[PDB]
Symmetry: C2
Subunit: 723 residues, 2 copies
């Protein structure tokens, strides 16, 4: 929180939790990066003169922008490294020369225009530094925005551009931050994946050159999550230096590390410059989304725990932010599309009898929507299928003791829909080109006000028509032929970002209009599982893959950044679907109860003993839900490192914990296995259900001797309680 | 084959296949190791003078035995490295000083007294060098025996000790060979395991110090197979230098690499010196078992293919050496012990109808043997259970079209047996100590002639009583309290080796007495799967673990040394037993049909569709059996390196092949996979059943695009035939 500027040293010192982030003004208004790491009281701000690194000041051959470590570097006036931003002028030049002009420090944390951002509830929680840079010749101002939190090791960064000149300025690249580390002796971690296998942890040594994760899909994507980290060579889950970079944005991104000839590592992150430009007319401004930067010297768990608390309590919003989330059941595979009102209610009684709390109605309740082909965009209740509308169904579900929820997919329109026939120009498209389809549908142009107003109107008409208290908001394709008939040629490349701004406006309006609704975002599973979406909808469908073994990796990687409260995990029926696997009902429960728990099956196909297990799972999860959704989460064993996965949840006072252990392909006649715990009070004794009493110190330093077992999938869960 | 001695250079050059092995006489009769690698026409035989490496000849300070690379080094007169042998004299000294005396070269390959050994069928196949060493002071002679094969890159080595003096000599250590490599820039491979998981491949860098695999179990063991290899850092299955060391012995062994201060690698192998001594009275001799040394520069497949051909055709013996082996079914789990004659015959008709060729009768046919507790040693047919004896049962099985086989366990005796009550001193034991049991049984003292004669008599009485044409010879525990009441104190530590010599004599007699019997050795699965046993029984039960996934590793590692003809692999019923796994009947067939194929289940529990699959598996294996059991085997993908396993068999003329592919835990929405083949004619075109026609070159250089699939266990097999 404690942000200072020392006029003698011209140094900015941002103290965030137990971390320091230090910058310093250098020569004629350059802004240098000095340090970011464990908190220091002070740090004083060599060899900037290097062969083939040229001199911006002919009178001063002591430095180059090619060697000075910076906060917001440009290319073209002596730095040859990857720039944080680039601007093209009317004369075609791309040379810009920002210098420090002034700064201000204030308590609290500002909102970002049109954008999600971490926030504070009290000014005392953080302090913000704004450093105003300017290129006087062209009238370009860039304000670097920094916030340091008191309680957490969190620095947040963004940049705001403003054209204070009399000419057009075209932003070709506008990243949210850039930081030059003094060495490149780190591994990097990022989170690549695909549909059905999101956010695998990938750790790699750095190369001398560039390495990056990005999305060009108009959505943050299944393929790369907008998160990267630099980690010390020897750092692991429990110890060591880790620097995380998390982009609070749900569209295209670039997350990059470039290592230069002097083995310094430039980390940068922001809206993907690929296929992007932004035109600033005189007087216009551009605000980047923010990047949330976390430091820990307590390994990956230390970093994750920071993100979890920050994101759960100061990014997610609304009535359910700090509330236990309902155990839900999705009633899709009960019917695919095949539905009408008579079934649904008895089904709801069966589900209610098992203790399930929320009944969700899936796709095909609307219009002529009856495969992945039709009526998207026409959001009126198909009053054949539900003649009594949503109201009659919902109210009965409520009188059964369950909440009622609904699926929507408002960003899509079917070529065969009334909306498309009335307004074909309302989809993203480019002149004279075929309109490529994903799952037989097109993308609505949310860069347009009329489109957004129409969606707000139409979805509100549905949501206010029944006592709905949960909505799953799905988006099931990525953008092609990106353009808008409502933008001029010179702004066409703003389409993807304006689309996201439009979606953000729409979601902000929808969640405000319906404060009693828990919204869960979805994009073919976890295709937009990012901090930007979390600001609008406090939980997310983690993956369409609900296979127990597959979920071990998906949940483990997702937890690197995202709080368990946001991480949807459901028990589904087997034969599994994406993969093909058979694991016990017990086992799938064990994996799913390690997330935000729910069900995704046909209850009409269950044996009494199965429903009986489900009744027990539900009762069990209710007992540990506060611990799972709000406790401190520790990863113990990594499925990316072998055949085991293990993790645990610990209460704030360390008096209670829940431990989960998994092993795949356990061999015959195998060595005994052990599990060392973390996060307990070493001087406290704990009762482990079914295993007796152990010292916290015994559990952490010697570990639990795991009951010997062998088989295709071992799954164990234990509750711990201080004696 | 071509073994020469050059009197000018005093160099021995052994040319084996496409390899050279070169030694040279040095100074006053020392024998130096010069080279072992790819064949050279000649190789000429520095810095032997080193600080703290002392001089055996005071008049010659140019060398030390601590630095000279040797063939059969001793400790005590200047070499401080691990010795190949050690002898204690009556005066308590352990210093011995062997020097070269003479040598002889002859065509062919000798038999080894009391021992198995690779052999030749014609003198032209190999040549043998015997180098006679002697310590005149004590009258110790050691003859180093070397054989070089013409056709294969194979050098075999053993040593023969003889006391030509007038005092007692006690051998404390008598390894079969030792070789000093000039560098230690290799990895080593060995084959550790356990019951139910034999012969996992373990590859490790060398340490400066000693690393070794050994057995102290009186049996070669499940825990370490008597095989180690040195491999070039970059060597793999298909290319690179590999040196294999395979011990033709079934008892205790040591296989060791010691790297010294000058980073030379001494590889040695032989009877484990631990708990071993051998007393040589004047005039007595001791022959070590042999070690079979293979070189390849074509990677691990090149080495394995050499061992496979050598061991299948010039180690294994008897009528079935070159014969396709019967598809058998073991009728244990049909009954555990619960049996009598009425069932067995109808069972045999069902099995015969499916095309199965050999009916095997398991444990509990004898005496009072009805759990793992009783009557071992009493080998008379329990004529309650089989009133018509083995003859009536066997003859009916034969008239049904199947051969008849039997299980025996002749090395064990039950405390509750008549043998034990008549001769309790006939077990291995030490005076006044408790007799530890393994599976409620004791080990018979095969170091004793009376014991061995009794076993030969008793087992022969059974085997000649019926038209038996297959015997499984099992041994289900390891030795404790090793001793013999028939040896004096000074020879007690010879018990383990004399036991093995006794077993060898017994097995040699039994297989000669019953030339129409295919004998398969077994020791709780592959607990004595070694070249020593192969010389007596041409196939082996690979592992008690018949789980398909588990067998991928077991079979892959076993194939590193042992021919597929010897590698028993059976389809069993699921729930699997050691592990707990469910894989398709198709899948288990695929893994088992990649070995010497058979069945191990209860046919009375099979569905018609299952028997129908079995009928098809049997027909399929009959079609590819010659290719599997006698074709050239290539490992393609390693289950020790990831989730895939793949291998193939190619006919001698390369016109036919069988390819098998496996993958465990195939993820949803996975990358496409490919398989590149080996061993085909690149200019030939091949039809792959179910995939069309491909060039041999296409198959090997571009590979097969595998049909995309996902699931817990993927299993595929294809027949290839030249168009």
């Amino acid at each position: 929180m404690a942000v200072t500027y020392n006029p003698q040293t011209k140094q900015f010192h941002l103290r965030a939790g137990k971390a320091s982030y230090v910058m310093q003004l250098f020569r004629s208004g350059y802004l240098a990066h000095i340090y970011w790491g464990k908190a220091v009281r002070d740090v004083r701000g060599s060899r900037l003169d290097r062969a083939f690194s040229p001199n911006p000041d002919p009178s001063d051959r002591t430095f180059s922008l090619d060697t000075l470590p910076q906060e917001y570097p440009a290319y073209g006036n002596t730095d040859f490294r990857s720039p944080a931003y680039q601007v093209q002028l009317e004369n075609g030049s791309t040379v810009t020369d920002l210098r420090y002009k002034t700064h201000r420090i204030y308590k609290g944390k500002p909102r970002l225009n049109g954008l999600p951002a971490t926030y504070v509830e009290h000014e005392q929680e953080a302090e913000t530094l704004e450093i105003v840079l300017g290129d006087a010749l062209i009238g370009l101002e860039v304000t670097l925005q920094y916030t340091a939190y008191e309680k957490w090791n969190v620095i947040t960064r963004a940049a705001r551009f403003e054209n204070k000149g009399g000419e057009r300025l075209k932003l070709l690249r506008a990243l949210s931050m850039s930081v030059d580390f003094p060495t490149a002796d780190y591994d990097w971690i990022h989170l690549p994946g695909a549909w059905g296998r999101e956010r695998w942890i990938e750790r790699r040594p750095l190369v001398t050159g560039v390495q990056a994760a990005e999305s060009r899909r108009g959505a943050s994507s299944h393929q790369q999550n907008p998160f990267i980290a630099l980690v010390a060579k020897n750092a692991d889950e429990h110890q060591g230096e880790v620097y995380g970079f998390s982009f609070v944005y749900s569209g295209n991104f670039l997350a990059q590390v470039e290592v230069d000839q002097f083995h310094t590592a430039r980390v940068s992150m922001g809206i993907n410059p690929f296929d992007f430009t932004w035109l600033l007319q005189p007087g216009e401004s551009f605000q980047t989304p923010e990047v949330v930067m976390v430091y820990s010297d307590q390994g990956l768990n230390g970093m994750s725990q920071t993100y979890h608390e920050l994101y759960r309590t100061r990014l997610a919003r609304g009535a359910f932010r700090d509330r236990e989330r309902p155990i839900l059941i999705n009633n899709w595979e009960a019917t695919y599309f095949d539905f009408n009102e008579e079934k649904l209610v008895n089904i709801a009684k069966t589900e209610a009898e098992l203790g399930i709390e929320l009944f969700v109605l899936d796709d095909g309740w609307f219009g002529k929507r009856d495969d992945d082909r039709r009526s998207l965009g026409d959001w009126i209740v198909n009053r054949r299928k539900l003649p009594n509308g949503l109201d009659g169904l919902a109210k009965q579900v409520n009188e059964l003791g369950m909440q009622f929820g609904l699926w929507v997919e408002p960003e899509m329109v079917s070529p065969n829909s009334e909306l498309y026939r009335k307004h074909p120009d309302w989809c993203l498209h480019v002149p004279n080109r075929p309109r490529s389809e994903g799952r037989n549908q097109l993308v609505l142009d949310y860069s347009r006000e009329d489109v957004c107003d129409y969606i707000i109107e139409t979805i509100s008409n549905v949501l206010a028509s029944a006592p709905i208290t949960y909505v799953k908001w799905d988006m099931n394709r990525h953008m092609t032929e990106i353009g808008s008939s409502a933008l001029p040629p010179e702004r066409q490349r703003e389409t993807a970002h304006r689309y996201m701004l439009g979606l953000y406006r729409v979601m902000d309006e929808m969640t405000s209009r319906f404060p009693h609704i828990l919204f869960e975002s979805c994009s073919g599973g976890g295709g937009r599982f990012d901090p930007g979406m979390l600001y609008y909808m406090p939980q997310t469908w983690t993956s369409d893959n609900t296979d127990a073994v597959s979920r071990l990796k998906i949940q483990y990687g997702t937890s690197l950044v995202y709080p368990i409260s946001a991480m949807g995990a459901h028990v589904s029926a087997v034969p599994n679907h994406q993969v093909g696997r058979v694991a016990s009902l017990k086992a799938r429960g064990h994996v799913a109860m390690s997330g935000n728990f729910g069900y995704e099956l046909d209850i009409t196909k269950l044996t009494e003993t199965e429903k009986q297990m489900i009744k027990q799972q539900v009762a069990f999860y209710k007992d540990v839900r506060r611990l799972v959704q709000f406790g401190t989460f520790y990863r113990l064993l990594s499925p990316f490192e072998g055949n085991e996965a293990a993790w645990m949840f610990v209460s704030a006072d360390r008096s209670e914990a829940l431990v989960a252990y998994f092993r795949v392909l356990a061999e015959a006649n195998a060595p005994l296995s052990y599990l060392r715990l973390k996060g307990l009070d070493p001087n406290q004794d704990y009762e482990i259900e079914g295993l007796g009493v152990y010292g916290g110190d015994e559990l952490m330093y010697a570990g639990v001797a795991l009951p010997y077992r062998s088989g295709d999938f071992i799954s164990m869960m234990w509750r711990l309680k201080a004696v």
